[PDB]
Design a protein around this ligand. Structure first.
Ligand SMILES: Nc1ncnc2c1ncn2[C@H]1C[C@H](O)[C@@H](COP(=O)(O)OP(=O)(O)OP(=O)(O)O)O1
Ligand SMILES: [Ca+2]
Ligand SMILES: [Mg+2]
Length: 430
DNA sequence: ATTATGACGCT
DNA sequence: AGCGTCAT
């Protein structure tokens, strides 16, 4: 009852760029705007691999993780922009730099957690308290929420999507008690007003559109964000959770899309998030462990406590290349040449990072895959990173991996390497 | 031959 | 530390 926490203490948003690498390429090349188009890396094998797809192209069934030759079968007029290649490998610098543009704008409104190259969580609790005082018990006009959906509404006693959006928004606003400054529903609504302003700023200042979710925690904000993509934002209230979760496949919730989520389904014989409410906390802990069980018990009631971490910058800087099929590295000189290529890109990115962000990486992680294994990594080894020098780093990497060579002859490499990976970690202020 | 990343958990 | 899981 009165002592039952409801997880309504925070306002959290998740902002996610729409079709992000495609938008980056469309800004650069106006010929690609408002077209079925996709971003592809490499080209020789099956036309290259698609890694981002415009919404126009998605209408034809084009997806990421699709080969371009196959995408062209669904969409003959599909336009393609290629990822830059430098030192023999895909180079994602243009997209990392575009990401920084967006992250810096978001950071003006609140402290953010960089969750991926194109999305960030925002803890808006304090900003909402501030705006609430400015409002002075003035109602929130629908005009302040021009791209906002209220999940679950409209209900009860219609043809158009925009019309339905407004219907729901009006029901929501009509029901708001604005004179309670601690009403969670009101707090979320003010949060949504701020996120409209944030999203407007991102589009004005970069040209990029995005979607967003507003709720009381990260998992609900993430889920909310996806409900109305692209170029829209969605408010998921605490009250909307029972209906939302009653038909929500467990795999849709962040962290449950893999083996754990499959085990929840199998072990408990359920399909939807809402069905979890019928188990005790101890029951869930018994199957999924203490931490997961407690997390699931709260999460299925819309409650989660994971904080928005104040972290705008990536904690690691890495460089990776696959050498599939027949291109696998079977000679020592091959291995050394590619380690150098990776190390040269790494040095470039590290030197820029040190200048921009006043920090230095202190640990180099070297990872390889050997033909045969279908684990992503076959072996991971760390060594000290004491200087930002590509030849030193590539020589050090070679030293820590050279023992994996089963070949009795040392010019040859067996089994051939199907992946190399260099990663700089353990930053210290500088 | 679903590539190139990046964070966090376990032991 | 090195490995695994999950994610974009
Ligand atoms: N598996 C991947 N491999 C390589 N790059 C990826 C992968 N997934 C995502 N990316 C890149 C390309 C995407 O434009 C970008 C952001 O990912 P993501 O948010 O999942 O999709 P998206 O921004 O392209 O479309 P959406 O509008 O659905 O968010 O990160
Ligand atoms: Ca996105
Ligand atoms: Mg994303």
């Amino acid at each position: 009852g009165p002592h039952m926490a409801t997880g309504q203490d925070r306002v959290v948003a998740l902002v996610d760029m729409d079709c992000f690498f495609v938008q980056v390429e469309q800004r650069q090349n106006p010929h690609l705007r408002n077209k079925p188009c996709a971003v592809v890396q490499y080209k020789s094998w099956k036309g290259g691999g698609i890694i981002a797809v415009s919404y126009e192209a998605r209408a034809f069934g084009v997806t990421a993780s699709m080969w371009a030759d196959d995408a062209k079968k669904l969409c003959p007029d599909l336009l393609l922009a290629q990822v830059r290649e430098s030192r023999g490998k895909a180079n994602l610098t243009k997209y990392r730099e575009a990401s920084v543009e967006v992250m810096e704008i978001m950071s003006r409104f609140a402290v953010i957690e960089r969750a991926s190259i194109d999305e960030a969580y925002v803890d808006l609790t304090s900003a909402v308290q501030e705006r609430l005082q400015k409002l002075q018990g003035q109602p929130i006009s629908a005009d302040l929420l021009p791209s906002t959906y209220i999940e679950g509404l409209p209900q009860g006693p219609t043809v158009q999507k925009e019309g339905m959006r407004k219907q729901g928004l009006f029901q929501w606003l009509d029901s708001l008690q604005i004179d309670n400054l601690t009403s969670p529903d009101l707090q979320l609504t003010v949060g949504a007003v701020i996120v409209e302003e944030m999203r407007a700023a991102i589009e004005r200042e970069t040209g990029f559109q995005c979607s967003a979710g507003i709720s009381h925690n990260k998992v609900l904000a993430k889920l909310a964000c996806g409900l109305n993509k692209p170029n829209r934002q969605t408010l998921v209230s605490h009250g909307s959770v029972p209906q939302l979760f009653s038909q929500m496949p467990i795999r849709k919730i962040r962290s449950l899309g893999g083996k754990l989520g499959a085990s929840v389904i199998e072990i408990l014989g359920i399909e939807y998030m809402g069905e979890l409410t019928q188990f005790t906390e101890s029951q869930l802990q018994s199957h999924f462990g203490e931490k997961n069980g407690s997390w699931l018990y709260a999460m299925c009631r819309g409650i989660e406590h994971d904080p928005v971490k104040p972290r705008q910058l990536p904690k690691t800087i890495g460089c990776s290349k696959n050498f599939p099929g027949k291109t696998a590295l079977a000679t020592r000189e091959q291995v050394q040449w590619w380690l150098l290529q990776l190390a040269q890109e790494l040095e470039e990115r590290l030197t820029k990072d040190r200048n921009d962000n006043d920090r230095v990486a202190t640990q180099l992680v070297v990872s390889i895959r050997v033909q045969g294994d279908k684990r992503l990594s076959s072996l991971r080894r760390c060594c000290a990173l004491t200087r930002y020098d590509a030849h030193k780093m590539s020589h050090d990497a070679f030293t820590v991996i050279k023992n994996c060579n089963t070949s009795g002859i040392q010019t040859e490499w067996s089994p051939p390497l199907t992946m190399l990976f260099l990663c700089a970690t353990k930053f210290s202020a500088s």
